Design a protein around this ligand. Sequence first.
Ligand SMILES: CNC(=O)c1ccc(-c2ccccc2NS(C)(=O)=O)cc1O[C@@H]1CCN(C(=O)c2ccc(Br)s2)C1
Ligand SMILES: CNC(=O)c1ccc(-c2ccccc2NS(C)(=O)=O)cc1O[C@@H]1CCN(C(=O)c2ccc(Br)s2)C1
Ligand SMILES: *Cc1c(COP(=O)(O)O)cnc(C)c1O
Ligand SMILES: *Cc1c(COP(=O)(O)O)cnc(C)c1O
Ligand SMILES: [Cl-]
Ligand SMILES: [Cl-]
Lengths: 359, 358
Amino acid sequence: SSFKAADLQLEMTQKPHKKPGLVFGKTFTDHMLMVEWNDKGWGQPRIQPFQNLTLHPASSSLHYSLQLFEGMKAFKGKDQQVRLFRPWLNMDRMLRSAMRLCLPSFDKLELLECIRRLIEVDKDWVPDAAGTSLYVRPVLIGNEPSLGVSQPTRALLFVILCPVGAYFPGGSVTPVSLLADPAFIRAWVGGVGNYKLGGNYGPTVLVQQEALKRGCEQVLWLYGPDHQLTEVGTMNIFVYWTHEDGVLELVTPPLNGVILPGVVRQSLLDMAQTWGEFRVVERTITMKQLLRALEEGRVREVFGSGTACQVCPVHRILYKDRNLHIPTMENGPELILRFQKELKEIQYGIRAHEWMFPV
Amino acid sequence: SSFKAADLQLEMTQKPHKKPLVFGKTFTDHMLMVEWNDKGWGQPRIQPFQNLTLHPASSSLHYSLQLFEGMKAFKGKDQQVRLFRPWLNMDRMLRSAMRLCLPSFDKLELLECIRRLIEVDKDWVPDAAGTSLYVRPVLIGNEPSLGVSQPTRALLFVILCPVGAYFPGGSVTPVSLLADPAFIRAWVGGVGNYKLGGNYGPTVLVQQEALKRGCEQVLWLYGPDHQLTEVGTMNIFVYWTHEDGVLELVTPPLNGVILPGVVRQSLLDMAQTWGEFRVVERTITMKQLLRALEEGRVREVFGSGTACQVCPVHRILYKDRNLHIPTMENGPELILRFQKELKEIQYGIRAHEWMFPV
Ligand SMILES: CNC(=O)c1ccc(-c2ccccc2NS(C)(=O)=O)cc1O[C@@H]1CCN(C(=O)c2ccc(Br)s2)C1
Ligand SMILES: CNC(=O)c1ccc(-c2ccccc2NS(C)(=O)=O)cc1O[C@@H]1CCN(C(=O)c2ccc(Br)s2)C1
Ligand SMILES: *Cc1c(COP(=O)(O)O)cnc(C)c1O
Ligand SMILES: *Cc1c(COP(=O)(O)O)cnc(C)c1O
Ligand SMILES: [Cl-]
Ligand SMILES: [Cl-]
């Protein structure tokens, strides 16, 4: 049985830190959530001051990557009300990751209430300047003090919080360049690339360095012999184009196992479907199709989606030592700006919406 | 700007543990620890076995910036302790470090620090038949940042475990394997050929499935031709008469999906040195194995790795098809020979350049 928010233990900090007057992910708030699991089940969850973890040096979290995480944002409106964006989807994803790594199950609504309580305690850390937010990082790790590759009998679930600045200076989207080299493979069918596991990230650090060495800003992850476009950096990928059949559409790759099911990705699909102005589809996208569409002037916008900046335009792709210009900005970018605006209105509470979870 | 064994700081334990045996749950009294940051490597230290203190944003825990090694030290009858081909583990550890953008170090300095550590804990090294000391070096990223990036801080540590005999009784005991193409350990373009923690966590659930289906370990298949890549966390070997009528030992080649085992390389080296049969690195498919079994051409199938040296296989469940592998009905002659020769080398019965004295 899960830990219960009703059993939450609180210890306030005696070392409150001054708030920022901000690189992503290096500044943390005063408190954290911690819950321990062992052979007698889950202990009581606690909100405690931000502090170090103490781990046995054989901890399976460090030897065999028994580790998963989530990432979601909370936003503060004019009324100083803080709200989480579709957090139930992050909890669903987190539980699926836990099962994949044989880590203990928990109740999604109990964890979400514990997170709400934590954010409520640190509510003053949530910035309210334009484009700013609080990044919420839940983690679940195995913690067996054994070198056996096995299901752990101990685990730790914790949550830390970061205030974050605006991703774009002045809120105005700026496009990125991408390296598209089939040598680099993020994930495989039947693998674990569709789960938010730590193991999926470490190996990309060197690849991103190669991208920079080749004059590109992010990696376009290609898959298969037909060079399917799967993801971009740590974001999902979308293409807005007139398709080979003459119909204007928004396409993103389907959830076939090599795609992480992004919350923003799902939200873009939901939003575009609701408008009912153009075709919205989940279909494989190949470099062959993109090359043709570009030569025929059919591509309007290409962009990544994710919690980091909601949506980010792409203007260049380096493929087979050839630079492809992507005319996203020439096309407004109308759709990107529309999605950005609707998300901003929902996230900051300008428009009421069931997607927002009040703290 | 590597750490140097000459700078080692020794802190002896004031609370030694009583000596003993399940693998990997019992640890010796001391550990090696070295930290890295913007100023480079700090001084290495041998200190009492103790917990790690990690910032909650440590990149080791979020983005799996972590790698490890595994090697054995063996105590001969005159109480001399020796490591088996440790230079190869150091080589592999450095390749792992580079792949995860973790700091380089001098392989001989680490090896000397490890030697010094084992020396301190020498009385933990057992000397009964088939026993050894398992050495577990680890290198982890340790940047207090949620940015997916090259860390500016890292930790290198080494812990030690006394280990009992893998085959209690002394005689090899074979295992059953589940071979289901649904399961994928590694892919070409991935990192399965590096000893990185990320390659291990996802296998836990798969191993549970093997147990549920009545098998002991997983036979990792790859590709449309159902290539046999590895078994459990060991390399795989087949000793058979191939389709061209030639007696041969085959193991899959290092083409990206195979971890380059130290035992694996040693078996190839040993068999090539004997010069009695063909020794090759070539992919092995289930189609070939099926045909070879029907034709009575398979002699032995086994895994190789530090845990057992070599382990016979007697059964493979290939989806719903239960296949007897006649390893034990064939001696298993090759397995016994490898085990004998390795034992002679590892326990100092026969002096050899492969052994590093402590
Ligand atoms: C400044 N960086 C961020 O705000 C950021 C925060 C969290 C994660 C983060 C941390 C862990 C896991 C995933 C992450 N990304 S996400 C899902 O939050 O977008 C990633 C972040 O940004 C990096 C840099 C830009 N980026 C990209 O993927 C791309 C930019 C433009 C294109 Br097109 S792709 C990732
Ligand atoms: C009793 N277990 C061990 O001694 C052991 C030690 C280290 C590692 C260990 C830890 C981390 C990384 C790799 C490991 N294996 S290794 C390279 O030491 O052999 C694995 C160990 O054993 C498990 C159980 C058996 N096994 C197998 O792979 C197979 C048995 C028979 C066949 Br055929 S396969 C793995
Ligand atoms: C987290 C993640 C996504 C989806 O991100 P959301 O923030 O949930 O939209 C996509 N791809 C990768 C690689 C990720 O890590
Ligand atoms: C370590 C390892 C090997 C090879 O092991 P050695 O002990 O070096 O012979 C093979 N496969 C996997 C999956 C491993 O982790
Ligand atoms: Cl944002
Ligand atoms: Cl052994």
